[model samples]
Target chain A: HVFFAVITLFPEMFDAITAYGISGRAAKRDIVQVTCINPRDFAEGNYRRVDERPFGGGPGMVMMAEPLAKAINHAKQLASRAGCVHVPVVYMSPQGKTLNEQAVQQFVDYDGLIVLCGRYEGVDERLIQHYVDQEWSIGDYVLSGGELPAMVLLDSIIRRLPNVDGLLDCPQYTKPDQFEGLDVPEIGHHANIEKWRFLQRYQRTLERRPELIEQVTLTKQQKKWLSDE
Target chain B: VFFAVITLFPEMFDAITAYGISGRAAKRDIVQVTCINPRDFAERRVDERPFGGGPGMVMMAEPLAKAINHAKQLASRAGCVHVPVVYMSPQGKTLNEQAVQQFVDYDGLIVLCGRYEGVDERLIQHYVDQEWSIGDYVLSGGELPAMVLLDSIIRRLPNVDGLLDCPQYTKPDQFEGLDVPEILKSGHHANIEKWRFLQRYQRTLERRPELIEQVTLTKQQKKWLSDEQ
Candidate 1:
């Protein structure tokens, strides 16, 4: 099972995503696990201060370095004990690389991830420089905080995990093939489903190792398609 | 103070309206949310086979168009002005803070949350007045980003900002471990104001330098920049 260590100030906010839909089912089935670490808990003051004034000057509070570092380290230690060797700590920031389907696919391979959610002005630059493995932006727009983005990332990642439902590949169907004048196109009308799968496998092999295709047997149609290509 | 969402799973939105600032704003009626599910309006099945033989199903056009029209009518009845129907798609314009600011000016906005492979392209062409994406990343659905957009916009409302603007602080200036900044407690109004302004500028310069260009720098700000240099 993959694990996610989310560092944030509002741990309760996660309940919304965690308690619903595919993410909820994944968590319940133990296909994934999520742990929230609050930097405020690691903070040093009686007030548990976790932000400080920016050095150069501007608007908003910057999450202080010390508490956030401590929180991330704690998360890393937890992941390590759980057998996660390459735990990537991603800080959600507007300045980071924009997340995409390819990025989500790449992230799913890791044993675990430490997801840091930034707020206010943002996390301290020093902490990001020293501890963050990478930074990710969910999209071009800004939100109240990083929690939604983190949830978005988590939801996408969790749904991609293997399950009894056969890997959850893209658009799904339910009852009533014919509805409202729209109908699920008959597979035989264009492409046979089984043949489609086999062709895809061969297509991948062709792309990866063209020589391998020659060894495999091919039908007249497959030959025709290959020649057309 | 108004929102209209087109989604298949309206339950997911409880996360936004039931929590923290969003919850409070909603309770105060400073912001209101209304969800319209295309499934509710679907004459038959809401989704169907893709025309070009793609992997996943696509949401049909008629149901979505009907839902969007209903939402627009409702928004109009609510006395919203310049209501724009937006379809959230990966192919749309990238969302950012500037875009969010611009969106707030509209008296109402109807956000269409696409699912499956995507809604029918024809529906988008016929019903959508604008297309906006939060970032380059793809998610399981657009609901979370829609919620994020709502939260960002609501917080910027006048009454909400008033409640939010007071520099938030909690008790225990000195935590058992975390310490409050000396400047925050210094209580010299002018210096504190100067310090806050400087901190905001410095943080922006360090994190989002592009944001700096959007505003004209005052003499003091220029002086502060030179001092830092």
Candidate 2:
């Protein structure tokens, strides 16, 4: 199981994702554990303010280094108590490395991840330098905040875990067999033709749906085509 | 602005339209989203299998065509621009700030979200004017990508407060182990404005150094950028 801890100003914003979809099911099943640590909660003062104007002056506020540092440390202690060591803290930023399938695959191996979601202008540069292990950019486009990207990452990772995805193991189908002068292509006609067509379909499906590999029953020759290395 | 989305699942969208910046945008009438479920337009008793068969099901052309036409009719009645429909596909061009800006300029967008193996290539040929992929990685469906695109576009629209790309900050200039930058509270408007701009340039330099080469910077900005390093 993978543990995901997010540090954000809006802790309630996550319920939208955690309450629905495959990620929702995964959480309910305990296949993955998710926690939220609010920097505001750790802020000193009645206002619980955790952000400040940029030192060099800017149009937006930057998250304060101290509150964020405290929240991240708190999250790390929680992960450690849960038996995770060497926990990686990932700050979501536009300047960070762009995420890809390979990156997601590598992320699955981690015991836990502390995702720092920035708001306003972003966090103080000093905080990033002092606390973050790496930065991950979801895409080139910008959003109002990093919560959505965090959800995206969470969903992508959860689906890769065993049994978190249902029927994802087998090929999925809906509706009837033929519609509006178009018919589902025949997967069978001749043995050689069927094998060729199935192989093509299998290859295409695997590109995006590698989690379903276990459900496919490949023949001896087909198995030979799939290599571990 | 109107955003008409074509998808197999409509409920999945509530997570975005009901919360955060996009939700607030919708509530304030800054933008609008209307979901068109292709399953609703699908012909009864027709098999929705793909032609030239591949793994999983392929969305047929007729229902999708009908759905697109319906959405187009709504957009035209509402006086949207005469732009071709946009399909979310991995094969499409990558999304970026430039693309989001162009999309924002449109009167409205009819976005198609494909499922199963994907839609008929013929449908794309006949109706799609453009294809946009959020990034190189693939998700289980296009809903997240569409939301990502929509969020980016909505925030960039004119006059969205506290949510725009501009830097922002709240009260609490002093806190334990943290304090707002002294320059901000100095009340020197000219110096503050210049400093803000320079900081923005420095951020871009530090995070995406390649962007500096693409855009022209002011002399002062150029000096600050070089000096910062």
Candidate 3:
């Protein structure tokens, strides 16, 4: 069981994970819980604006520190009450550490996480300096906001969690054996169906078959050499 | 005006189409995003246990092929002379701002989002025009990565083009007892521009020096930076 309190403007965007696929199943089983804390809800202004023009000059607006800081504090407090011993406040940004499989593994060490999703330019540097504990980037590319990246971070970690679980091997077909006049590869028709009894023998034998068939036109003395094997 | 996505969970795209700046573009029809569910093309289950596999089912090739074909038709009709099919995967070229800009050139594009282990490898060789990765990380599915790509493209579409990297602050001018520098509010354009230029250059140097490689600076700018250094 782990808690991740996200600071984002569009909490509904999160339903993509909480409502579908393996991550959704994980949420239902209590393997992980993702909660959203909108900074607008914490704003004091009449318009409750979460972003405004940059300090100097910029095309995109910047996220204010006060509302985000308040949101982070609230999220952190919730993690504390949830009995999390270590709750790291992570900001999703292109400037942060690039994430990988190893990063996903490291993130699971915390009992809780408070992820801040930035829109527009990004959040105040002061907020990151005073309240945030870490910054993460899913990749070198930038997205419109941190919300999608937050979902990615959460999904990456969730799939690596203890119970959650790849194929370089082959394709799986679901229902109809034939669709639109094309046949699905007949049930396990081209599979290593031995079920792990003697993989050593099966592997070498299968390997030899492919090599023998594909290497059909051996050089002059090759037939004599093959006869020996 | 059209970008198509072939995925098992089409609704997962709501992350972009229903929220934030990307959502705004979607609402205005500046960009049209389409989702084609591979599941709909399949007669039954869209995935099953993989062939010669240990664990986790992979998506069947036929459904994916059908879905991609449908996506191509939609995009082509929308005036894409050569709509490329981009597959989202960890093994692909790592996407960056440059790639995002290049992707904007295509009148429209189709994205394939994978799930389970992945889609049938044959489908990739046969249908994928290109492959792109958000970064080095492995997530549960390609849904979020696809969302990231679409978001980047939407922003670059006619009415919305602007992106810069940074530490930004919003309204209230003063927060945590620190005021936004008086020069910005001074209403002096030239001075404000100079201040911003220096701040951005210094901040990049302070953190990500590698990006400074492609950046060209005027002699005055260089002198200003050296003075600070």
Candidate 4:
């Protein structure tokens, strides 16, 4: 089973994650699991203060290393109980590498994930360097915290899991049907689509995001068509 | 006034933007608005036949150009109405830069957001030009396309506009005490409250941003907090 543990400052932000979209579906079908870890819960202070001044002078305060490091360690314990082995302790940050379809596929195949969502100023660089198995970015920008990006990554990864019926590639509910004039992209129906036209569409996609072909490992002919762009 | 207009193929993809905090407010007359055209409404054959013969129809080019122009025109009009235009696009540098200064200065804004598989190169290159992008990195589109940058801008805008509530920024429903938090004695209720508020606020804002420390907040912070009521 694919399992996910998200470490964040505000665990409540994930309430919607459990109730919506592919992640919701994954939860329902037992295909994947998700958990949240809040660093503040582990803080030693009277109030759960999880941040402090940066070691060097800079803009904002950095998330304190102690509580955050403890939170990550705590998540590893939970992952072990959940039967996770070689699980990914993925830190969602703009500073990390961009996540792609291939990475999503890899994550889906993992035993579980211990994901860390950095907040204000971000986690201590020392903690991230020490315990993080992988640093992943949902996209190329920063967020108030990593919860949103973590949710985005979880949705993308879970939706691509096999045997989910309605959730493979990009399945549409209906074709040529306009919900307020928004036509679902034509891929939802296979019967109405033709064979060569489909290939041509792939070429068009290559023209748009040529990098995807290599990443998804398209066929020789597909690569050639993409090169033709 | 600074603004950006975003556009995409489905329009539905933007529901995420239209449903949330800032974008919802933007649509509700709290801020300026702009949008690129939806491909479903593209003037051409809508979707060109796909090239590689795969899944989805790529967004058409010509009409997308028109849509981008529409956003730019709206942005220009907002400039005429307010201050200037800020284009939120993928090719722009990723969010960084003290963007609050711009938000605090403008009363109105417009953003030109683009979406779909991708905006055709010609439209992005020819029509939109290279000037306005706020960051680098591609997303599904520009819906929450520039969210990081947008939030930074919005927060920095003088809270004096009744944007944040009193409890969010101040103590004692009315300023029952004299002077702002800075002038109040350390043990005074108002001063202590302000300290707690500031400490929490700053901690909550942890490390993704570096420029938060330089903010020149003023009495307007109290006025802005009251405006929410």
lDDT of 4 by residue, A1-229 (tens): 6778888765655554565444566687888777788787898779877766533233565676667668878888888888777676888776566666556667667777788876656465556557888876654433456766776676666767775511112221222244334443444344344433345556554554455555455556645654655
Return whichever of 2 and 3 wins on DockQ: 3
Off by over 4 Å in 4: A165-203, A206-229, B1-229
Q: Give the per-residue lDDT of model 2 (tens digit) for B174-221.
A: 544455566666748766766666666666656667776677666775
| Model 1, runs deviating above 4 Å | A19-22, A39-70, A124-130, A159-229, B161-229
Residue A57 lDDT, candidate 4, scale 0-100? 32
For residue A119, model 2's alpha carbon misses the true position, in angstroms, by 1.5
Ranking by DockQ: 3, 2, 1, 4
The lowest-lDDT stretch of 10 consecutive residues in candidate 3 chain A is: A165-174
The lDDT per prediction is 0.73, 0.72, 0.76, 0.52
Off by over 4 Å in 2: A44-48, A165-229, B43-50, B161-209, B219-229
Evaluated against the true structure, the overall lDDT of model 1 is 0.73
Sorted on TM-score, best first, the list reads 3, 2, 1, 4
- TM-score head-to-head 1 vs 3, winner: 3
Candidate 4's TM-score reads: 0.51
Top candidate, metric TM-score: 3
Residue-level error in angstroms, candidate 1, position A87: 1.6
